[PDB]
Amino acid sequence: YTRVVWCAVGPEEQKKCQQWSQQSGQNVTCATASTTDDCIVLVLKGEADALNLDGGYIYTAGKCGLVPVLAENRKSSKHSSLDCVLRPTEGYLAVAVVKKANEGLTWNSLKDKKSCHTAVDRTAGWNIPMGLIVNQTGSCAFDEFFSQSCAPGADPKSRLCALCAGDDQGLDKCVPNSKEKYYGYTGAFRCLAEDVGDVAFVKNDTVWENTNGESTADWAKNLKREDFRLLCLDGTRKPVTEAQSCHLAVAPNHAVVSRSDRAAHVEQVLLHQQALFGKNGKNCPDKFCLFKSETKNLLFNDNTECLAKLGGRPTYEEYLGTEYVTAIANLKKCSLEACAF
Ligand SMILES: *[C@@H]1O[C@H](CO)[C@@H](O[C@@H]2O[C@H](CO)[C@@H](O[C@H]3O[C@H](CO)[C@@H](O[C@@H]4O[C@H](CO)[C@@H](O[C@H]5O[C@H](CO)[C@@H](O[C@@H]6O[C@H](CO)[C@@H](O)[C@H](O)[C@@H]6O)[C@H](O)[C@@H]5O)[C@H](O)[C@@H]4O)[C@H](O)[C@@H]3O)[C@H](O)[C@H]2NC(C)=O)[C@H](O)[C@H]1NC(C)=O
Ligand SMILES: *[C@@H]1O[C@H](CO)[C@@H](O[C@@H]2O[C@H](CO)[C@@H](O[C@@H]3O[C@H](CO[C@@H]4O[C@H](CO)[C@@H](O)[C@H](O)[C@@H]4O)[C@@H](O[C@H]4O[C@H](CO)[C@@H](O)[C@H](O)[C@@H]4O)[C@H](O)[C@@H]3O)[C@H](O)[C@H]2NC(C)=O)[C@H](O)[C@H]1NC(C)=O
Ligand SMILES: *[C@@H]1O[C@H](CO)[C@@H](O[C@@H]2O[C@H](CO)[C@@H](O)[C@H](O)[C@H]2NC(C)=O)[C@H](O)[C@H]1NC(C)=O
Ligand SMILES: C[C@@H]1O[C@@H](O)[C@H](O)[C@H](O)[C@H]1O
Ligand SMILES: [Fe+3]
Ligand SMILES: [Zn+2]
Ligand SMILES: [Zn+2]
């Protein structure tokens, strides 16, 4: 009744979820699926209650009647007066990132280069950059723009998966879960850093979190911010310090979603879980921390300070905003109102 079933995507989220479940005295239990879409289907059936979604997936889920419940909020320099839970969310910066050493690569010379995407259907990794590229090219053949990519969730035999690596054993090439080596923000940035691709479509925060000693992960140990450049829409290249003047869009924060009839109960439970396991929680450093997973963004983004109440009790369309929503609608007309399942 007052027990919430979390949906985990893939085996590593399942493991973190199992630890959370144990620590919460089974106030939270876990269902697992191989993809985010499969998790949304579990929620629709009533077999799971909730999961934290990227903006692009909130759009999929919303068309099926799921609703935003609480949003990730990270640290801000403005609005510092208000408590984290009550503070408005700011949104993250979607950016395109290249190596400094790859000279003369600009936004206007991306055609036939190698790209690294978080996953198909995601905001910074897919919807924003491909929407821009479709508009600019006047063509829906975005699968022929780049010579080779890693875009988890695309056909494994296509060029959109050519650069994906799969797991330790080479299995699960291009699956949109953290088994794929180049999945997610961190995976797409790794694909760039290892020089598999020429450009990575990620958010501003990923670059900072994985450079200048901020990670310690073996591939990121020695990465320096100065070795990277952002691509701006005016054809220039800028240091990573200038993302406020050199980004592709501001994205709505990742948010917990649930079935409408469950929303109120999911919200109550999660507010109490973060008091126990969130940033300054009673049990975090000691027993368990909800918002940590060694740079791997499992369940929630590691930079999350708290989950925030929404206010204006927004629908999915209001939460995402009219800007972003019409961008996805236009791109989706390349690949009609209804749930996708
Ligand atoms: C791209 O992504 C990166 C990564 O996410 C991001 O950089 C991070 O941004 C955070 C800032 O928003 C960084 O700050 C945090 O970490 C520092 C560690 O050094 C901590 O140190 C202090 O924290 C205190 C308390 O919060 C700060 O004091 C606050 O209060 C004062 C009141 O006087 C205010 O200062 C003012 O700030 C304004 C606006 O910036 C400035 O113009 C004024 O001149 C004035 O000085 C302000 O409210 C302060 O926050 C104190 O100043 C220190 O910050 C904190 O805990 C802090 O929260 C975080 O470290 C960054 N991460 C990393 C890894 O580098 C980028 O911002 C992002 N870029 C874009 C464009 O979004
Ligand atoms: C790829 O290209 C496509 C096609 O161009 C883009 O889709 C278009 O995006 C436009 C920008 O979002 C969009 O423009 C319209 O803008 C109006 C006005 O926006 C207003 O903002 C005001 C803030 O000052 C605010 O006061 C207003 O309330 C309002 O929000 C929006 O309203 C119009 O629509 C009404 C339709 O009946 C009309 O009555 C009214 O007078 C306005 O004209 C409107 O919703 C819309 O956002 C445009 O509609 C989109 N075009 C098409 C054909 O769909 C994508 O964004 C591009 N992709 C990317 C990633 O950039
Ligand atoms: C699991 O959830 C329960 C229910 O919310 C928590 O126990 C409740 O504690 C509150 C006050 O803190 C009481 O008002 C309720 O009576 C309790 N519920 C019942 C029926 O036991 C409990 O703290 C949670 N446990 C953990 C570790 O998260
Ligand atoms: C936290 C939440 O975030 C967005 O939905 C809006 O900016 C809104 O104003 C705020 O309440
Ligand atoms: Fe995202
Ligand atoms: Zn902007
Ligand atoms: Zn409303």
What one-letter code names the amino acid at 113?
K
**What whole-number distance in Å separates Cα of residue 278 and Cα of residue 297?**
14
Check residue 88 and report its DSSP letter: P
Domains of the chain: 2-73+255-316 (3.40.190.10), 74-254+317-327 (3.40.190.10)
What tokens were used for 136?
């600019």
What tokens were used for 244?
């406020």
- What's the CA-to-centroid distance between 305 and ligand 1, angstroms? 13
CB 301 within 8 A of CB 73: no
This structure's resolution (Å) is: 2.2
Check residue 76 and report its DSSP letter: -
Identify the bridge partners of residue 93 per DSSP, sorted by sequence position.
Answer: 250
Check residue 134 and report its DSSP letter: H
Tell me which residues have their CB closer than 6 angstroms to ligand 3.
Answer: 2, 24-25, 27, 276
Q: Residue 35's closest CA among 67, 65, 13, 63? A: 13
Neighbour-count burial for 120-140, b at 16+ CB within 10 Å, e otherwise = bbbbbbbbbbbbbbbeeeeee
* Residue 327 Cβ contacting ligand 2 at under 6 Å: yes
**What whole-number distance in Å separates Cα of residue 150 and Cα of residue 123?**
15
Q: Residue 162's closest CA among 143, 179, 178, 142? A: 143
What one-letter code names the amino acid at 96?
A
What tokens were used for 326?
């019409």
289 conformational bin, left if phi > 0, alpha if psi -120 to 50, beta if neither: beta
**Coil, helix or strand at residue 162:** coil
Ligand nearest to the CA of 249: 6
SS3 content of the chain, % helix, strand, coil (to 5): 35, 20, 50
278 is in an annotated binding site: no
- What's the CA-to-centroid distance between 167 and ligand 5, angstroms? 22
- What's the CA-to-centroid distance between 25 and ligand 5, angstroms? 31
Identify the bridge partners of residue 52 per DSSP, sorted by sequence position.
Answer: 256
From 1, 2, 21, the mutation candidate for ligand 3 (largest count of ligand atoms within 8 A of CB) is: 2
CA atoms within 13 A on the CB side of 11: 5
